[PDB]
Amino acid sequence: SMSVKKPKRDDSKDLALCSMILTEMETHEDAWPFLLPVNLKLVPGYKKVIKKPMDFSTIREKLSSGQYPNLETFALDVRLVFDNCETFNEDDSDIGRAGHNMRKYFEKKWTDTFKV
Numbered sequence: 001s002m003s004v005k006k007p008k009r010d011d012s013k014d015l016a017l018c019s020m021i022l023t024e025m026e027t028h029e030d031a032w033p034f035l036l037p038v039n040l041k042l043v044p045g046y047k048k049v050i051k052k053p054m055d056f057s058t059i060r061e062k063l064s065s066g067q068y069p070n071l072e073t074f075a076l077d078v079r080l081v082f083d084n085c086e087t088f089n090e091d092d093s094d095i096g097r098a099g100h101n102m103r104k105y106f107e108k109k110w111t112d113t114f115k116v
């Protein structure tokens, strides 16, 4: 509360670490469904069903221009990619299984990096 400060973690490395984690995402072999925005004019239903589209390149752009206030908001956008993926794709599909794989990869890097 006012004048009652909780100890807070050093966050000066956060931007560098999120960038590294995102680079590992981008270079994973199953990252191809998520490297670029879903083409809303070639994929039927996507714009109507998916209210907040998100992809790695957009996350990279936002990270490079100071649009994430904290690492939490960064993880929110990453999770959004895989949540949109689950919403639209069957679990057995190539894209659908990619998102499960890629989600697990991220959450392990997230834990290993910030909960270490």
Ligand SMILES: COc1ccc(SCC(=O)Nc2c3c(nn2C)CCC3)cc1
Residues within 6 Å of the ligand: 032, 033, 034, 036, 037, 038, 039, 043, 085, 088, 089, 095
């Ligand atoms: C020409 O066929 C293509 C297949 C995959 C891609 S990759 C960009 C992309 O749209 N990925 C994606 C999709 C869905 N979810 N996600 C994440 C539903 C269907 C498409 C581009 C062209």
